[PDB]
Design a binder for these strands. Sequence first.
DNA 1: GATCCCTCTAGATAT
DNA 2: GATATCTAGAGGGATC
Lengths: 23, 529, 503
Amino acid sequence: CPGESLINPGFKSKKPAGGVDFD
Amino acid sequence: NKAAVVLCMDVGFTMSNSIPGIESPFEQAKKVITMFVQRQVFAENKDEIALVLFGTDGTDNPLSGGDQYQNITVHRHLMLPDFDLLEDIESKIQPGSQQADFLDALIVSMDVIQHETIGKKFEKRHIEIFTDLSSRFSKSQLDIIIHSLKKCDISLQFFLPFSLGGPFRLGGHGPSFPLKGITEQQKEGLEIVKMVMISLEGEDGLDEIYSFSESLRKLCVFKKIERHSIHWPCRLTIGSNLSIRIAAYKSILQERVKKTWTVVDAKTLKKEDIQKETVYCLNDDDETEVLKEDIIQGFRYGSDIVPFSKVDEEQMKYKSEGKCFSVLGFCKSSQVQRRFFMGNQVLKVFAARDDEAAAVALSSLIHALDDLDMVAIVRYAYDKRANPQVGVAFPHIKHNYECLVYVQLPFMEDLRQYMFSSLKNSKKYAPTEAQLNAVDALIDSMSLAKKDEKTDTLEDLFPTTKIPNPRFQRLFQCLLHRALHPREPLPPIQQHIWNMLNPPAEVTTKSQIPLSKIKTLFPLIEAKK
Amino acid sequence: YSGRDSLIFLVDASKAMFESQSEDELTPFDMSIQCIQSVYISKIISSDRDLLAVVFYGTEKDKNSVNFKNIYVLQELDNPGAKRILELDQFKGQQGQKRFQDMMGHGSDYSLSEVLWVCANLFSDVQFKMSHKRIMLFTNEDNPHGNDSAKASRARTKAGDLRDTGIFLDLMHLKKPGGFDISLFYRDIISIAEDEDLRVHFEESSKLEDLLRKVRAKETRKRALSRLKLKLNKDIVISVGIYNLVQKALKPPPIKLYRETNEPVKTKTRTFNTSTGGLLLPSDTKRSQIYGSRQIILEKEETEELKRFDDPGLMLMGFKPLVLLKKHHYLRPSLFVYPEESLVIGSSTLFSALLIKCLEKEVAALCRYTPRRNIPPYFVALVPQEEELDDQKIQVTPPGFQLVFLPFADDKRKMPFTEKIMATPEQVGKMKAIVEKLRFTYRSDSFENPVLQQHFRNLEALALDLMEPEQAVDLTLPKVEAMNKRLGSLVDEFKELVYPPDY
DNA sequence: GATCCCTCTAGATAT
DNA sequence: GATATCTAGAGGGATC
């Protein structure tokens, strides 16, 4: 399954926060 | 801080006329006044309440000298309301057989305000009049009344059996007392009241003329004595060189009962004889008492436990810079979904009081956000000991004020990533065209908004946001019933409470046939357990 | 619950893993050790109620209960812990390699079928009900098992019947000297949809970066808050489930424990009379409230009864257009409503029809909400929610109704009247320029709770006896320097336009 | 029947 | 310096 976390199966992987990035 | 409210309620024989199927105006006014006094007593407010009755057989007021201001009695002077007043309202007050002028009664009540306010500090002097206006009155003191009310800074409200503008239902969302039995005397009284309200305020007093049925489902009685919340001073900082002095108030904050149910002994009814304790014992068998100071803080780390003392946790704790309201950046309003709002409060951000420069700066920010259809993502921290939050500050422009509304936004950890099966793509859960048409008819029939003709404004037929919380009124009723009749069971929920909580009878009647179609087209069967 | 999660870490102990291609990189053995350390930390933070194990093959000693050769079961399937983390940290890189070589052998022959049998029986030993059976295999060669076709075929049959059982065998492309040389044994020994790893993979790492990316979250599983009944009237009733798609994550509460022996201490609270000292039954107490000089006495059942209005569920008051739902009328976080066919049949069909028609007509179902017994009701609006799929065809917004609470009359606070001071169009334009300069794209997961992050770092440092807790970076802070550089003279111009030179 | 989660009610202590 | 928020003790549901 694409976009699936390898640590906790059944839940999508969490993208890193990043914060505020000005365009 | 403290207000002086005088309830000038009619007692005359006219309001005792009970039209079949409709509760009498005397009973409706009694219910409204009981609603007001119940909150004023059980909320422990410091406002002092006086009760003036006009239309009674007897006379007792400091204005009677023989054939003037007759049939008006001052039942209660300005003092803290109590269960004595509540019992007087419930049972000891009886309808009279005489008639009195609702303007002479206003004179008497203003006299009470003026000659009992001295020696005490009152920020507000409110007064409410409950009458049906179906009595002959002398309109010769209007100028004096208006001048005295304006000079003494005394508010006004009026409550009538009919609203200003199926079966009648007290407290419901529908037509009030029918607009066909109003006599010419009532018409003259109504136009006099309209003129008085106009002269006192301007245009918005026509909104301050209520009916008992609609006042039972509104907080309008407490409108002129409600206390405004305290402000939260801070600065709205954009970058490190642009600061705007602001003041924030809580718009929506769920109200809960302040008084707590004290646990007392079933015999002596005293909390002193009953006291709790905590017991610390080992989780294994042979529970042994553990001394209070022989326990240290700990934490779970997987299958193990680690000690983490209070002082060590304080030393290693995340330390905030302090109170702040700082903009992290601006984003489109469409990117901040309403379904992601967090927290348990809503903040409205105004400029600092008596600060024209701050007002101009905040208005410029609000107008820029509104024109660009953008919102501000801000960092909010109530104090240096408060956990910082990230939220959205979207503009809110009205005809009399402008502000930024702050609602807390979620963090990464707050979101829940749940998978739900698709409904549109489902094959076994696909409604047919007949079912879709039946649901369409149901939606059309159960509409709670009416589109006004010749105007593009939608009128709400069930504005629940103006309905007070029924739990407080139910609790007050139960407490008063127990206080007055200590040896009787609690009374049932009041019919007008149920009526304001129920949808309009027009909607209920209209929703009959479509609901039958839904029942006959949707085979709902309960699964056997 | 739907079962727990089980993971087995399979690490090769061949001599070829102990060497490094270059000298500025990290050797495969301790790099995989760091991988497992990161997985343990992530599981402890997020999903501590899972099972993790580490087994080594290609060694001299053995400790597996079923007693096969050249296989060391270092850890059994059990919950992750700081003790296990430190035990595996005992083999970390420098001097870790020497301790590994001193405590277990390396370079010895091994059998893949033997290893898979060990993994299978190790899974079978634990009695817990598990949703997933996954093993991660760490190696960077395939030569030793390619010499004997008989044992290669035996290992292939072992993978086959493990796949039939439901063992989700993963492959980790580890740092190889001259390439892993896939498509001989490890391509068809694993369970894959297709040849995604069709390249030779000269690179040392494939998914190790996201294997090392730690997960600092509570990671809660799906569970319906309440299985209520949506009542159109007294006769048409459907069953729905209530879920919280957003819930404010809390710092885990501290546990009280004995000082020197360090075991949890349970707490029991008892109420007794001061005079007699004996225990009091719940019928021996009454609830009291005092107003002024009058005391009101109620039973506990009476106090619970006065809060009772309606039976639990949702009663459909009517349908109201979405334009009448004011955005600034937020009271408490919204809930999600989804149909439940396990209670009433046809609930899904009626829910789908209602959702379709509400979305078409842009109306919200106004309902009276009673979460449970003896609780006052609130008015809620069932805002229709359409399913939203991104470019990857994964679900980001579930279909259903968004149960949004509506405030009551006394939930709203009035505010002091202010003077509506208007802003000139030039000032509005200057702030427009400022806002456009500070524009950015917002996502719901763009920020992390600094308090929770710092608490997790502190807990990890204290449990692992680190020299100092590594400080979390507060992403919820204004980048003041970047903002000033981006703005420039716009702020000064706005201040000149608005603020008089006294304020 | 235990456990975990989630509101609700109640107590305290800083800013 | 009243206040609000943070933190710390009692019940109902879901799922083992």
